[PDB]
């Protein structure tokens, strides 16, 4: 199923689903927490020309949203206002309860005309678009976001 | 003498671990929403197929009372709650060795 | 693969800081300021490995997000807690067994 990492002491190892270790202890739901990690840490180029090439428009795919409790400070963040020659908006309006990325050192604003070959915009590499504790596969208009991926780990906080 | 039930069940469903590959999960190059589903057929068994249709018709009665009571427009936790009740009935209370309610065998 | 050994993460914790008087909705904190800061450093293994898991977790998570019809899925964490308990105590627990976690 979904991979879940465990940290015994100051080291992260992963336990296969079929095996069963009784030494692992889950005391409460607070131990489990979901952490998003931005692509900046992965050494990819954060420049505007490379970011717009990674994103692409696609139809027939419904959007999906996943929540993440913890996130990382982003040096570069992107806000998109994009229209076509007819003035129509390629990206949808931000839904209720969704807000921009909380911590951004630089917010890049790119406003230009281009064709959209799809209803929603997805990441070609498959990276999720970060938001305020809600990760979405599609971009939303006028909302600052970061490129990141989400992980789930087990923390042995009390012993 | 009872061919009201259909012994052949051709079912549409989704795919959990069905595809172990890693170059297609990305939604941009992924398949369309209409094509994600996988098909399967169960046949040559009278009991399993007819009993399935029997349970859901009876389950509908109790399920309606649950939906009316809950204010949620969409309740996805019905199945997950059942798993919680499964564990709570056995290990919820003090588990006595060699007891009827406690599941422990020495 | 480039890794950042310093992890500066913003998160909210329910249990860690309970200050009081900030819960009132009229005087409560602004949306931008509710978050708290933390820093992870001086570790080669834990910091880089976390970025490795999330890149790989996207694979299994994408198939799950496609399978679920909910627009917003908050039940991912709750499902894992159930599976953890179901794997051990779900069935009959035999004393001194490999699956059973019982020690006399």
């Amino acid at each position: 199923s979904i991979p879940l990492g465990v940290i015994h002491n100051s080291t992260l190892q992963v336990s296969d689903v079929d095996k069963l270790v009784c030494r692992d202890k889950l005391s409460s739901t607070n131990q489990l927490r979901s952490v998003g990690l931005n692509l900046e840490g992965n050494g990819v180029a954060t420049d505007v020309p490379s970011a717009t090439k990674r994103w692409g428009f696609r139809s027939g795919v419904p959007p999906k949203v996943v929540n993440y409790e913890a996130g990382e400070w982003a040096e570069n963040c992107y806000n998109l206002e994009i229209k076509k020659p007819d003035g129509s908006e390629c990206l949808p309006a931000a839904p209720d309860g969704i807000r921009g990325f909380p911590r951004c050192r630089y917010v890049h604003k790119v406003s230009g005309t281009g064709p959209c070959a799809g209803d929603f915009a997805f990441h070609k590499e498959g990276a999720f678009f970060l938001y305020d504790r809600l990760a979405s596969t599609v971009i939303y208009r006028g909302t600052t976001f970061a490129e990141g991926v989400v992980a789930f780990l087990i923390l042995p906080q009390a012993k | 003498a009872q061919p009201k039930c259909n012994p052949n069940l051709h079912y549409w469903t989704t795919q959990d671990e069905g595809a172990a590959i890693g170059l297609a999960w990305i939604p941009y190059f992924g398949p369309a929403a209409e094509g994600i589903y996988i098909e399967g057929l169960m046949h040559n068994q009278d009991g399993l197929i007819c009993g399935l249709r029997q349970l859901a018709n009876e389950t509908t009665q109790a399920l309606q009372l649950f939906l009316r009571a809950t204010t949620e427009l969409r309740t996805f936790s019905i199945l997950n709650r059942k798993a919680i009740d499964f564990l709570l009935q056995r290990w919820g209370g003090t588990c006595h060795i060699l007891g009827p309610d406690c599941c422990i065998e020495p | 693969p480039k890794c950042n050994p310093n992890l500066h993460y913003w998160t909210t914790q329910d249990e860690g800081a309970a200050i009081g008087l900030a819960w009132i909705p009229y005087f409560g904190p602004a949306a931008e300021g509710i978050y708290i800061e933390g820093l992870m450093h001086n570790q080669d293994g834990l910091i880089c490995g976390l970025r490795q898991l999330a890149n790989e977790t996207t694979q299994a998570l994408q198939l799950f997000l496609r399978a679920t019809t909910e627009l917003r899925t908050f039940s991912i964490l709750n499902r894992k807690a159930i599976d953890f308990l179901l794997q051990r105590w779900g069935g009959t627990c035999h004393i001194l067994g490999p699956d059973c976690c019982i020690e006399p």
Partner: antibody
Amino acid sequence: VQLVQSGVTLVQPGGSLRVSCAASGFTFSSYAMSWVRQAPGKGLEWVSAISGLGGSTYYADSVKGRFTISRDNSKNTLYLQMNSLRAEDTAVYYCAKDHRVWAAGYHFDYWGQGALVTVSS
Amino acid sequence: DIVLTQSPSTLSASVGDRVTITCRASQSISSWLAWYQQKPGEAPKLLISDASSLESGVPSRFSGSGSGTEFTLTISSLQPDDFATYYCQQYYSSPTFGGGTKVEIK
């Protein structure tokens, strides 16, 4: 950047056998491995795959029941434990490493020499 | 699932002759494809990946093109070392190897 398979093996029907794929010269845990078998006079067939981290394991529809894959990052060795062997499973098994993608995709640049397993009994 | 097919199985060729192999996948796998090279008794060697980019240490004469369902592996000049079986693997679906193309001299 070389992968070493087991030299020779022989088994019986339904027998159990372990194949060890040794890896050295480059970082192992960074990449995800996979098993590919080649039957005599037949094309390559994918057996099983495991992610670089080891949390996710992947098997073929025919191979999911009777095969088990495991890897240890500390020893840099890939173990494929084979159970309930059949005559159709007699093939030279190959283990390879990712060509380009890092723990994402299954591309293979560099392949091992292969291990021969004969279930004819 | 998805299984690609190869038009030529055994292609006769000579030194310095242009060779083109056509590998067509049943569904649309977009740009994710690779070609392999296997000599008798030797492990398969990666020729090209993604159908665009060539692996380091691979001769520059080898090239490939095509998008979506259609793919063509083209060798502008054939060499004595070049006689081996060639398979095409697509990563979109479950891993599927082609029938293979063996090259001989006639």
